[PDB]
Amino acid sequence: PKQITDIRKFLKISRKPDTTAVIIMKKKSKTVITKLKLRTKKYLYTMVFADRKKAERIENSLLPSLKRIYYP
Amino acid sequence: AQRVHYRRHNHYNTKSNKVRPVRTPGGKLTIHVVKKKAGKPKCADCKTAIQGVKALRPADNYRARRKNRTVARAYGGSICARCIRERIMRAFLFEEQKCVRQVLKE
Amino acid sequence: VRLYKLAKRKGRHMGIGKRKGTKNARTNQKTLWIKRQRVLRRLLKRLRDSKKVDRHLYHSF
Amino acid sequence: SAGDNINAKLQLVMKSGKYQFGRKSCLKALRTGKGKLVIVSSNCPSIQRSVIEYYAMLSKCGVHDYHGDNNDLGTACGKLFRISCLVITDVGDSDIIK
Amino acid sequence: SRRTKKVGLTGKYGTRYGSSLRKQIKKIELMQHAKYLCTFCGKTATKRTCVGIWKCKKCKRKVCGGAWSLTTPAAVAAKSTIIRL
Amino acid sequence: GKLLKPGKVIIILNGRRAGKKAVIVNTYEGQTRERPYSYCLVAGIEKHPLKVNKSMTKKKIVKRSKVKAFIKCINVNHILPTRYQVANDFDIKSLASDDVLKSKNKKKEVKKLGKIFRDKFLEPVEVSKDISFLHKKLYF
Amino acid sequence: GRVIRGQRKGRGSIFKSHNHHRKGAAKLRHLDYCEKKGYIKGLVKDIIHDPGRGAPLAKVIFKRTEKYGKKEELIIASEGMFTGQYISCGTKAPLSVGNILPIGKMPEGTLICNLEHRTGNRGTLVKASGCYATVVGQSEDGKKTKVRLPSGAKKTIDAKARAMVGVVGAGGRIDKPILKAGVAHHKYRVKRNCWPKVRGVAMNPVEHPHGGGNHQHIGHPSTVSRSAPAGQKVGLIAARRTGLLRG
RNA sequence: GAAAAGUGUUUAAAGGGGUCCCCGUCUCAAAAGGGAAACAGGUUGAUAUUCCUGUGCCAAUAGUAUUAUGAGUU
RNA sequence: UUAUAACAAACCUUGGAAUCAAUUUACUUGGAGAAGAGGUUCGUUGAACUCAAUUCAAAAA
RNA sequence: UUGAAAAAAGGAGGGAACGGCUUUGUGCUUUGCUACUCUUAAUACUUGUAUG
RNA sequence: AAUAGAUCCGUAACUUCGGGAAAAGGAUUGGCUCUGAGGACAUUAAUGUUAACUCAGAACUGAAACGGACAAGGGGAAUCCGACUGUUUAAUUAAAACAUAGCAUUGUGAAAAGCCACAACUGGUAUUAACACAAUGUGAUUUCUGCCCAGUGCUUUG
RNA sequence: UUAUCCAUUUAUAGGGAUGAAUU
Numbered sequence A: 001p002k003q004i005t006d007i008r009k010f011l012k013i014s015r016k017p018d019t020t021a022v023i024i025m026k027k028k029s030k031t032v033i034t035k036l037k038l039r040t041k042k043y044l045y046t047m048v049f050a051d052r053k054k055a056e057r058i059e060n061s062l063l064p065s066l067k068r069i070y071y072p
Numbered sequence B: 001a002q003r004v005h006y007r008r009h010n011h012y013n014t015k016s017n018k019v020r021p022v023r024t025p026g027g028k029l030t031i032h033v034v035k036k037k038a039g040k041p042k043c044a045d046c047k048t049a050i051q052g053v054k055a056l057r058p059a060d061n062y063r064a065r066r067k068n069r070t071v072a073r074a075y076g077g078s079i080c081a082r083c084i085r086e087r088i089m090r091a092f093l094f095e096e097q098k099c100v101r102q103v104l105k106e
Numbered sequence C: 001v002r003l004y005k006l007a008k009r010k011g012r013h014m015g016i017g018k019r020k021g022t023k024n025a026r027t028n029q030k031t032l033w034i035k036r037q038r039v040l041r042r043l044l045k046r047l048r049d050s051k052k053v054d055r056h057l058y059h060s061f
Numbered sequence D: 001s002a003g004d005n006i007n008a009k010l011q012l013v014m015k016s017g018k019y020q021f022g023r024k025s026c027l028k029a030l031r032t033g034k035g036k037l038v039i040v041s042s043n044c045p046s047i048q049r050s051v052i053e054y055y056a057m058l059s060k061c062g063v064h065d066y067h068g069d070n071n072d073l074g075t076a077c078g079k080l081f082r083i084s085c086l087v088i089t090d091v092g093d094s095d096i097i098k
Numbered sequence E: 001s002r003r004t005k006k007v008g009l010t011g012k013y014g015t016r017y018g019s020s021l022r023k024q025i026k027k028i029e030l031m032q033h034a035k036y037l038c039t040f041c042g043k044t045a046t047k048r049t050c051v052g053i054w055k056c057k058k059c060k061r062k063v064c065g066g067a068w069s070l071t072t073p074a075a076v077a078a079k080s081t082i083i084r085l
Numbered sequence F: 001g002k003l004l005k006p007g008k009v010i011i012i013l014n015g016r017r018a019g020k021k022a023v024i025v026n027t028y029e030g031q032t033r034e035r036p037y038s039y040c041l042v043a044g045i046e047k048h049p050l051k052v053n054k055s056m057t058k059k060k061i062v063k064r065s066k067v068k069a070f071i072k073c074i075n076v077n078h079i080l081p082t083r084y085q086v087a088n089d090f091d092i093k094s095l096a097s098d099d100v101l102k103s104k105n106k107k108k109e110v111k112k113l114g115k116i117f118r119d120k121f122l123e124p125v126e127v128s129k130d131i132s133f134l135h136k137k138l139y140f
Numbered sequence G: 001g002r003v004i005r006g007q008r009k010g011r012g013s014i015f016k017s018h019n020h021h022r023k024g025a026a027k028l029r030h031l032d033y034c035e036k037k038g039y040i041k042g043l044v045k046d047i048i049h050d051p052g053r054g055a056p057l058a059k060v061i062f063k064r065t066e067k068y069g070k071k072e073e074l075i076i077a078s079e080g081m082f083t084g085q086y087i088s089c090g091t092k093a094p095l096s097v098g099n100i101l102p103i104g105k106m107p108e109g110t111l112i113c114n115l116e117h118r119t120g121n122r123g124t125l126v127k128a129s130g131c132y133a134t135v136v137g138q139s140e141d142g143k144k145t146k147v148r149l150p151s152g153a154k155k156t157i158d159a160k161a162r163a164m165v166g167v168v169g170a171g172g173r174i175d176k177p178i179l180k181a182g183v184a185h186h187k188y189r190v191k192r193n194c195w196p197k198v199r200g201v202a203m204n205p206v207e208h209p210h211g212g213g214n215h216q217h218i219g220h221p222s223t224v225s226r227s228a229p230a231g232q233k234v235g236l237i238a239a240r241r242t243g244l245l246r247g
Numbered sequence H: 001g002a003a004a005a006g007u008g009u010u011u012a013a014a015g016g017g018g019u020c021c022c023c024g025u026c027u028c029a030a031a032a033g034g035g036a037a038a039c040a041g042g043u044u045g046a047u048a049u050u051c052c053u054g055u056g057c058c059a060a061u062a063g064u065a066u067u068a069u070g071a072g073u074u
Numbered sequence I: 001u002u003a004u005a006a007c008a009a010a011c012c013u014u015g016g017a018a019u020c021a022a023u024u025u026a027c028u029u030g031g032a033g034a035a036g037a038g039g040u041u042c043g044u045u046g047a048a049c050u051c052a053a054u055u056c057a058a059a060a061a
Numbered sequence J: 001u002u003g004a005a006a007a008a009a010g011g012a013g014g015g016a017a018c019g020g021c022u023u024u025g026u027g028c029u030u031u032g033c034u035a036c037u038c039u040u041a042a043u044a045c046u047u048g049u050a051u052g
Numbered sequence K: 001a002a003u004a005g006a007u008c009c010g011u012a013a014c015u016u017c018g019g020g021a022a023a024a025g026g027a028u029u030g031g032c033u034c035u036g037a038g039g040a041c042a043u044u045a046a047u048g049u050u051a052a053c054u055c056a057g058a059a060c061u062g063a064a065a066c067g068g069a070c071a072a073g074g075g076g077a078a079u080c081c082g083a084c085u086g087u088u089u090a091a092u093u094a095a096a097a098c099a100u101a102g103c104a105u106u107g108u109g110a111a112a113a114g115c116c117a118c119a120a121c122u123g124g125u126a127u128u129a130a131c132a133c134a135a136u137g138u139g140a141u142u143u144c145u146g147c148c149c150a151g152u153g154c155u156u157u158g
Numbered sequence L: 001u002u003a004u005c006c007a008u009u010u011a012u013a014g015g016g017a018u019g020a021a022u023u
């Protein structure tokens, strides 16, 4: 499992066709934190956002053939 | 205390079967087998450890990226810098001496 | 046990009669020496760094 | 007798004169051209000795193979550490240059 | 306080083994555990590894030599003869 | 005297250029906040001309005797100076330029240097010993 | 009766050598064109313990004259050899401690070791720690040379036979008492199982000529003929004299 | 050696690596030596580092042809 | 190659040491280059460290 | 008493060999043009069914 | 049975000067309430936050008791044997037997040697080489080891 | 010396004057 910090890199990864599923998790922080996981054939890449709206926007951006798993 | 047991087949306290007791998310204390500490790769002359080489076991050395095995000198990851220097000096100076000897003869 | 430990902290149960290990077993002479030397040497190092003591003096001390 | 003379000369240099001992300093001196004469102990490890010789040749400096050990070369000078090679960069009253 | 008068290195042996034997050991143990003068680096660092093998700590040059001393007399004599030749 | 005069050939002792032989072009010997050490600036050969037979064809010979060069500023304490001096057989100022060490097209400069070296090897003159020395790969 | 301890040794079962940790056989160079007509120099790359031996070994590396590659010999180290010393071997070698020369080319008085008794034998005499032989003469006929072995014995060898100038390392190892039984235990533990030695006189008759009696005594002369058989040859074999040696 | 067996390079024409040369007895012998790679949680009446969920790791992966990925050379 | 941090070592540059110095619980080490100053690496370790991200504001190419 | 070996792996030394396509003559030589040599991953297709 | 743990004291003969030695032989020991000694850090010599556990001393206290159970040498003066640690008759003998270091003797210079094995070849010692291997005896140290070569053995000349 | 015997090595140049070393 890997972490991602460059949003652009994440986007690129998403664009790449072996990325079957996205996992999008909501977490009550000690505000609503959001973890964006992409499930690639090789690795499970995750991005952490402090900011909900940004997270939402990025989710929206994600290709609509991704197999989105809303965990909690 | 939480007690433990070997899980991998080898149930004796050998150098290969050394063990690091580790806490799980479950709360169970488990035993994890430590991969042995490898020997630092050494100089073809003085048998001192060569720098810039990850000391890895022969299994793990095969996988590691070529930068982690090599150093970019001449004799590289087989001879330390000091020794290399000395070798170079020998190669030059002795050659020079030979020439001098020849001159003397003639 | 906690009460006992508190009492020991105030020095209470420690005492000739309540003592079965040799002096070294109770608290190792070697460990005490180590402590002391480390304390002293550290202090010396500090002093020399501050320049409050000169090299020569430090070394002899 | 020769050895004694050499020792005396060394002493003289120490008293009045500019020197510096040990490989690196000596080499530096040679590179500069500041070295007038280098004196090298019997026990100086072969390669380094050779290097020193080469440097001297390049600078047309004298090479003097000191008869005695590392230890002696040091005792010959005022010093309680073993020496190996030293470079006189100015002779005072002393003759050793000639 | 200097602890032992006559014994020195053979205090480890204690009461056991003849006094004569311990005396002999003493010479040899002194010879063994001395740091000898290294003929290359100068430093008195040649201590004994194995029996006839003497490693300088400084330069790491293993000199073959005596079992107890670094140089036996016979060997030295031989060397001298060779030099003369 | 001053051992390392511009044009003298030296053997590098340290670094990636470990046992490579080279010509010094401009000595500095001035310690600074940037480079707190007397340094030499050197133009040398990494990959020497390979051994060649009379039997071989000319193009192939030329290919064989390509000489891959390098330009490196180096601590004088890392170089073994030689008796050999090539102030004559090269216009030395033309080999390496101080200013161009900084510049972007350093690889271009290196290439040019290499070409020059190759040319020199092709036309030796009468035949200097220094140049011969430079030609031969140091075996250690 | 039973088979005596001595007899058991020859079958070599537990009585074989403890060969496991030994570094290899100590041998001179093969006798090549080099060594016969000139000299070859090798580097002593390391000086090492060979367990069951008392004398340290020198791994000496030579460069093979007939194929590109370095090959290692195991020489017995003379005193004064050291790592990074060059050892030279051959007819026209120079006479220095360490070097390997035909006995013909060493003046009288020279001290030698690792001596081949026949040429090519890869060196056989004077190998034990401390020991040396002396060249005592070379005949006016040339050819043979007279040597004096550590025993005292004088022997005549070929002059072409090689040897090593100097004395073998680890001298005087016998000077220091073993003191403890355990140190002897450790000594033989690396050689072969010849230790403890129970006394024949402490055994029963089934076991040993000396065995039995209500007293612990040998009971019959303990000098036995050369021409005895296996279980008889037990006391002082073939003894020319006995008692405290006066000569 | 009558064989059965006894010895294992002692006087061999004893399979591998490269593009003819160069190496070279075979085989078995370690479930504590050497060694490619695994963890957690869950689950059964009875198995689990072996199933389940999840997360990895290791070793392969023939040729030819496209694609992309980056290097290097002009 | 977990990223980094810290630490025992090993090495590099500089520096040039007797009024010897650094230094360990222990002794070890030094003109074959010590201390000091700045680095490199392996090894422990496996999120230590502001570690990473983000918040906006100021200075370079 | 100096404290296994080998499989396996790695590093170094060394400098063997060297672009591709088209045309001509008996794998080699000559003539003309500039995307080449690697590299992982995916994909396709024949070859026994090419993942444990 | 007594002795025993610890702390403090004291510790002889004799000795191979290492030991003997925990010699012998004394004292103290609980609980409570205090006192003193012993660090780290970080402010700026004084003032802070703060940590073990150990030592030493003093009051009071009790049916004079306290290593309160548990656990834990009996010691000395000699003599005999074996120097010692070690090993041994599995299921009656643990020793004074064996071993041991030390000592001394003996053989052997080599693949035609020594010692031993094998039916035979061949092997072991030996990946060895006289400071070695083999074979005996005695059994640390100290101090010595006298006389006898006729008897028997071994051996040297031919 | 040719039988026989022993040794030595990869059966590796016919006899005399502490670098590298291969196509």
Ligand SMILES: [Mg+2]
Pocket: C029, C030
């Ligand atoms: Mg103590």
Ligand SMILES: [Mg+2]
Pocket: G197
């Ligand atoms: Mg005995």
Ligand SMILES: [Mg+2]
Pocket: G197, G198, G199
């Ligand atoms: Mg016995």
Ligand SMILES: [Mg+2]
Pocket: G202, G203, G204
């Ligand atoms: Mg009996």
Ligand SMILES: [Mg+2]
Pocket: G001, G205, G206, G208, G209
């Ligand atoms: Mg009988």
Ligand SMILES: [Mg+2]
Pocket: G213, G214, G215, G216
């Ligand atoms: Mg009896």
Ligand SMILES: [Mg+2]
Pocket: G215, G216
């Ligand atoms: Mg008796």
Ligand SMILES: [Mg+2]
Pocket: none
């Ligand atoms: Mg098998």
Ligand SMILES: [Mg+2]
Pocket: none
């Ligand atoms: Mg195993």
Ligand SMILES: [Mg+2]
Pocket: none
């Ligand atoms: Mg079960």
Ligand SMILES: [Mg+2]
Pocket: K082
């Ligand atoms: Mg006893």
Ligand SMILES: [Mg+2]
Pocket: none
């Ligand atoms: Mg006992």
Ligand SMILES: [Mg+2]
Pocket: K089
């Ligand atoms: Mg019994």
Ligand SMILES: [Mg+2]
Pocket: none
């Ligand atoms: Mg007995």
Ligand SMILES: [Mg+2]
Pocket: none
């Ligand atoms: Mg006695």
Ligand SMILES: [Mg+2]
Pocket: none
């Ligand atoms: Mg008598």
